[PDB]
Design a protein around this motif. Structure first.
Motif, PDB file in Angstrom:
ATOM      1  N   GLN A 128       0.848  -1.191   0.000  1.00  0.00           N
ATOM      2  CA  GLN A 128       0.000   0.000   0.000  1.00  0.00           C
ATOM      3  C   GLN A 128       0.884   1.243   0.000  1.00  0.00           C
ATOM      4  OE1 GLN A 128      -2.294  -1.091   3.557  1.00  0.00           O
ATOM      5  NE2 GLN A 128      -4.100  -1.427   2.259  1.00  0.00           N
ATOM      6  N   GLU A 129       2.003   1.173   0.712  1.00  0.00           N
ATOM      7  CA  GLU A 129       2.929   2.296   0.757  1.00  0.00           C
ATOM      8  C   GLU A 129       3.552   2.524  -0.618  1.00  0.00           C
ATOM      9  OE1 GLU A 129       5.617   1.257   3.860  1.00  0.00           O
ATOM     10  OE2 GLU A 129       4.352   2.097   5.451  1.00  0.00           O
ATOM     11  N   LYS A 130       3.912   1.443  -1.301  1.00  0.00           N
ATOM     12  CA  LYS A 130       4.509   1.562  -2.628  1.00  0.00           C
ATOM     13  C   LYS A 130       3.506   2.088  -3.650  1.00  0.00           C
ATOM     14  CE  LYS A 130       8.036  -2.017  -2.068  1.00  0.00           C
ATOM     15  NZ  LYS A 130       9.123  -1.002  -2.126  1.00  0.00           N
ATOM     16  N   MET A 131       2.232   1.765  -3.458  1.00  0.00           N
ATOM     17  CA  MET A 131       1.191   2.213  -4.378  1.00  0.00           C
ATOM     18  C   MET A 131       1.017   3.727  -4.358  1.00  0.00           C
ATOM     19  SD  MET A 131      -1.682  -0.766  -3.897  1.00  0.00           S
ATOM     20  CE  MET A 131      -2.661  -0.471  -5.389  1.00  0.00           C
ATOM     21  N   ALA A 132       1.407   4.349  -3.252  1.00  0.00           N
ATOM     22  CA  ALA A 132       1.287   5.794  -3.106  1.00  0.00           C
ATOM     23  C   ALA A 132       2.433   6.550  -3.774  1.00  0.00           C
ATOM     24  CB  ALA A 132       1.219   6.160  -1.627  1.00  0.00           C
ATOM     25  N   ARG A 139      -0.652  -4.664 -10.830  1.00  0.00           N
ATOM     26  CA  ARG A 139       0.144  -5.714 -10.200  1.00  0.00           C
ATOM     27  C   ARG A 139       0.118  -5.607  -8.678  1.00  0.00           C
ATOM     28  NH1 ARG A 139       5.250  -5.929 -10.673  1.00  0.00           N
ATOM     29  NH2 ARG A 139       5.233  -8.197 -10.312  1.00  0.00           N
ATOM     30  N   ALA A 140       0.221  -4.383  -8.165  1.00  0.00           N
ATOM     31  CA  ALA A 140       0.198  -4.162  -6.726  1.00  0.00           C
ATOM     32  C   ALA A 140      -1.135  -4.617  -6.135  1.00  0.00           C
ATOM     33  CB  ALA A 140       0.437  -2.685  -6.416  1.00  0.00           C
ATOM     34  N   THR A 141      -2.233  -4.313  -6.826  1.00  0.00           N
ATOM     35  CA  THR A 141      -3.558  -4.706  -6.356  1.00  0.00           C
ATOM     36  C   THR A 141      -3.680  -6.230  -6.353  1.00  0.00           C
ATOM     37  OG1 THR A 141      -4.612  -2.684  -7.211  1.00  0.00           O
ATOM     38  CG2 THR A 141      -6.042  -4.571  -6.793  1.00  0.00           C
ATOM     39  N   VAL A 142      -3.258  -6.849  -7.450  1.00  0.00           N
ATOM     40  CA  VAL A 142      -3.316  -8.298  -7.590  1.00  0.00           C
ATOM     41  C   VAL A 142      -2.531  -8.995  -6.482  1.00  0.00           C
ATOM     42  CG1 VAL A 142      -2.615 -10.263  -9.005  1.00  0.00           C
ATOM     43  CG2 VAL A 142      -3.626  -8.252 -10.088  1.00  0.00           C
ATOM     44  N   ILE A 143      -1.304  -8.537  -6.260  1.00  0.00           N
ATOM     45  CA  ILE A 143      -0.435  -9.133  -5.251  1.00  0.00           C
ATOM     46  C   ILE A 143      -0.894  -8.828  -3.822  1.00  0.00           C
ATOM     47  CG2 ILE A 143       1.918  -9.188  -4.368  1.00  0.00           C
ATOM     48  CD1 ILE A 143       2.855  -8.703  -7.276  1.00  0.00           C
ATOM     49  N   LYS A 144      -1.370  -7.610  -3.583  1.00  0.00           N
ATOM     50  CA  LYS A 144      -1.856  -7.254  -2.253  1.00  0.00           C
ATOM     51  C   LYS A 144      -3.026  -8.170  -1.888  1.00  0.00           C
ATOM     52  CE  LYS A 144      -3.846  -3.185  -1.890  1.00  0.00           C
ATOM     53  NZ  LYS A 144      -5.310  -3.467  -1.855  1.00  0.00           N
ATOM     54  N   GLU A 145      -3.855  -8.481  -2.877  1.00  0.00           N
ATOM     55  CA  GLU A 145      -5.012  -9.347  -2.660  1.00  0.00           C
ATOM     56  C   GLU A 145      -4.538 -10.734  -2.203  1.00  0.00           C
ATOM     57  OE1 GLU A 145      -7.853  -7.690  -3.401  1.00  0.00           O
ATOM     58  OE2 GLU A 145      -9.315  -9.250  -2.894  1.00  0.00           O
ATOM     59  N   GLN A 146      -3.507 -11.251  -2.865  1.00  0.00           N
ATOM     60  CA  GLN A 146      -2.966 -12.567  -2.543  1.00  0.00           C
ATOM     61  C   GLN A 146      -2.321 -12.637  -1.162  1.00  0.00           C
ATOM     62  OE1 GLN A 146      -0.300 -12.826  -5.941  1.00  0.00           O
ATOM     63  NE2 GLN A 146      -1.755 -14.152  -7.024  1.00  0.00           N
ATOM     64  N   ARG A 147      -1.540 -11.625  -0.795  1.00  0.00           N
ATOM     65  CA  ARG A 147      -0.885 -11.671   0.506  1.00  0.00           C
ATOM     66  C   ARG A 147      -1.887 -11.471   1.641  1.00  0.00           C
ATOM     67  NH1 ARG A 147       2.797 -14.453  -1.964  1.00  0.00           N
ATOM     68  NH2 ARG A 147       3.504 -14.821   0.191  1.00  0.00           N
ATOM     69  N   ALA A 148      -2.895 -10.627   1.426  1.00  0.00           N
ATOM     70  CA  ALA A 148      -3.912 -10.414   2.454  1.00  0.00           C
ATOM     71  C   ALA A 148      -4.699 -11.713   2.665  1.00  0.00           C
ATOM     72  CB  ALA A 148      -4.857  -9.286   2.040  1.00  0.00           C
ATOM     73  N   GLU A 149      -4.948 -12.444   1.584  1.00  0.00           N
ATOM     74  CA  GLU A 149      -5.677 -13.709   1.666  1.00  0.00           C
ATOM     75  C   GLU A 149      -4.863 -14.724   2.476  1.00  0.00           C
ATOM     76  OE1 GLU A 149      -8.649 -14.487   1.008  1.00  0.00           O
ATOM     77  OE2 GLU A 149      -8.654 -16.682   0.983  1.00  0.00           O
ATOM     78  N   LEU A 150      -3.551 -14.737   2.278  1.00  0.00           N
ATOM     79  CA  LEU A 150      -2.691 -15.649   3.030  1.00  0.00           C
ATOM     80  C   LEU A 150      -2.716 -15.257   4.507  1.00  0.00           C
ATOM     81  CD1 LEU A 150       0.363 -15.964   0.642  1.00  0.00           C
ATOM     82  CD2 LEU A 150      -1.056 -17.860   1.486  1.00  0.00           C
ATOM     83  N   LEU A 175       6.511  -8.314  -6.232  1.00  0.00           N
ATOM     84  CA  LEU A 175       5.950  -7.066  -6.755  1.00  0.00           C
ATOM     85  C   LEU A 175       7.040  -6.144  -7.310  1.00  0.00           C
ATOM     86  CD1 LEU A 175       3.772  -5.008  -7.319  1.00  0.00           C
ATOM     87  CD2 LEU A 175       3.916  -4.264  -4.938  1.00  0.00           C
ATOM     88  N   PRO A 176       8.138  -5.937  -6.557  1.00  0.00           N
ATOM     89  CA  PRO A 176       8.497  -6.459  -5.233  1.00  0.00           C
ATOM     90  C   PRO A 176       7.898  -5.649  -4.083  1.00  0.00           C
ATOM     91  CG  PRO A 176      10.233  -5.077  -5.951  1.00  0.00           C
ATOM     92  CD  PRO A 176       9.256  -5.154  -7.118  1.00  0.00           C
ATOM     93  N   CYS A 177       7.754  -6.287  -2.923  1.00  0.00           N
ATOM     94  CA  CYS A 177       7.192  -5.621  -1.753  1.00  0.00           C
ATOM     95  C   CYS A 177       8.264  -5.192  -0.754  1.00  0.00           C
ATOM     96  CB  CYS A 177       6.192  -6.540  -1.052  1.00  0.00           C
ATOM     97  SG  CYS A 177       6.938  -8.030  -0.339  1.00  0.00           S
ATOM     98  N   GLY A 178       9.463  -5.758  -0.883  1.00  0.00           N
ATOM     99  CA  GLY A 178      10.556  -5.416   0.015  1.00  0.00           C
ATOM    100  C   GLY A 178      10.523  -6.127   1.360  1.00  0.00           C
ATOM    101  N   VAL A 179       9.591  -7.065   1.515  1.00  0.00           N
ATOM    102  CA  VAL A 179       9.439  -7.812   2.763  1.00  0.00           C
ATOM    103  C   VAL A 179       9.854  -9.277   2.615  1.00  0.00           C
ATOM    104  CG1 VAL A 179       7.828  -8.502   4.587  1.00  0.00           C
ATOM    105  CG2 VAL A 179       7.530  -6.309   3.413  1.00  0.00           C
ATOM    106  N   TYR A 180      10.869  -9.674   3.376  1.00  0.00           N
ATOM    107  CA  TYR A 180      11.367 -11.047   3.342  1.00  0.00           C
ATOM    108  C   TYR A 180      11.800 -11.465   4.733  1.00  0.00           C
ATOM    109  CZ  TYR A 180      12.124 -10.323  -1.741  1.00  0.00           C
ATOM    110  OH  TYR A 180      12.028 -10.048  -3.087  1.00  0.00           O
TER     111      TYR A 180
END
Ligand code: NI
Ligand code: NI
Ligand code: NI
Ligand code: NI
Ligand code: NI
Ligand code: NI
Lengths: 117, 117, 117, 117, 117, 117
Positions: free
Chosen positions: E25-29, E39-50, F4-9
């Protein structure tokens, strides 16, 4: 439907996912926000894929030659149904989602008719 | 094969997974250790499922109405092929894995004929 | 490639998915429609991820110490290939998809050399 | 149930998978063949997991704060249902599968009661 | 956390995924490029689901009846946490990701208290 | 870790799954029941696969060329770690699970050094 086989099948699985597909298309028509549109597209893609999977399972696992013989249009019906779901993935028009549901309803009726034998 | 559509299809996807299925069945005949048998069964189940999926995709996405008309046996062929894979899931006999591969070869032949048509 | 081990491997799995990635990028250049772009991005992401998975499997399961000893550049080659796939995920330029395909071709060459060996 | 939200939910999704779980346990009592027992165990585990997922979704997404206040026992009901499914994973006794189905029937009733209100 | 049971759990699994959600969300800003937003929306959806999945597992598998009795607000707390993650899926505001993280921290505290007790 | 990358690992993801693997192996030595052995084998396979995935991600996504230049041993270390997990899949001996954990600890040490560099 797990291929054990377990003897448990229900077209409702495909119907419920297909209902989500159309429901999402209707919501997309009431909100043009970019991020909502992206999420709706991503999710509709996922639910339509699940719907196709459920139908593929009925086709490959439950239905057998006698069914395809008694219902000569079954192969075509299921194939049109999955193609309708693919079309729904590529559309925001609720009519495409409904087209899939129309086919699924027929598959469901045939399914239960074969269950009485 | 991703339903975009991307225009990229190849029965080799199904074939490679089917080859693992038969390969696993052959290994199961050379080692009766319980834990190996468990793992082999678990993994064979997963590989066979992927092979069924790949075939389902060719049937639902690649082949179009004109193809089913040109090849009256196509619906049945794919249906029998996926059923053969279900049979391989329930067996340790490499012959079942081979039967699935034979059907896939038939599908592969038709696939490439439609690509040249 | 299933970690049983089954003894069945083929770079073709990674290659077919990478080919879809480039094909999708090609299609994205011919259609600027928002929803198509969204679907193309979503699907390209999935195919590239599968391609990375296939390469990771070859690297972790198929290639053994004797191979890395005989091909000193192998570790780096596979790592560059998967990074190239990550770059393709973040790009609509078909050149990125092609770069991944070029690395896969290099890996494929080494793979088959170790197989005839 | 896809978290868009789509507004489409149905406890039937959980019920159908739970029915497969019990159906498998019953079949396991009729065939003591080792490989069948392995496949049945593997598949029962997958179906039970899906059932748990569907119930988790009803609890996390469908039911809202007002619902939990109207039905103070709801949290515990869903929690006991998912625990019942975990118990069914570790058992071949059809009674465990039925216990899960009984909890799901109670959740189903509350679900439809809230759908009218 | 695998339902064997294995006896291994850690709220850290949910936390790490939730951290990715806020990080995205920070990167999206900082980048309004359409494709990056997709891509950010797609991936954010996946990580939130996990993240939701990991919390669901703690709730269904790790926490036992005595725990819910000792912590009367625990059911509500976890439910609010998963709903906060659903809210983060539908938002680009890092504050939503943080709200989920705050709930996860509360769950983590209770988790370790039950582990040491 | 989402590309994404998200920078979190965090190597902790791989570690917790590897801990489950060893924990399951420990439990398999205390219960010889056939069905428990089947479930333990199935679940251990799943957790080990997830551990391999997390390590592959660190290798393909987190570590960059400069990192491998500073720690060339990283390629061998991660490759040995994933191979150790494959060995753990094929074994009930807790020592195999511990071997994987030992490699992960070495990778974790390097990981944090690169984070602080
Ligand atoms: Ni079934
Ligand atoms: Ni495709
Ligand atoms: Ni394999
Ligand atoms: Ni939904
Ligand atoms: Ni566990
Ligand atoms: Ni990430």
């Amino acid at each position: 439907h797990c291929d054990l086989p377990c003897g448990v099948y229900d077209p409702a699985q495909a119907r419920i996912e297909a209902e989500s597909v159309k429901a999402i298309q209707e919501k997309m028509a009431a909100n043009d926000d970019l991020h909502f549109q992206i999420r709706a597209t991503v999710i509709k893609e996922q639910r339509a894929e699940l719907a196709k999977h459920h139908l593929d399972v009925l086709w490959s696992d439950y239905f057998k030659p006698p069914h395809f013989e008694s219902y000569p249009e079954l192969h075509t019906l299921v194939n049109e149904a999955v193609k309708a779901l693919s079309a729904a993935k590529a559309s925001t028009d609720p009519a495409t989602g409904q087209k899939a549901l129309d086919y699924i309803a027929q598959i469901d009726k045939i399914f239960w008719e074969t269950k009485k034998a």
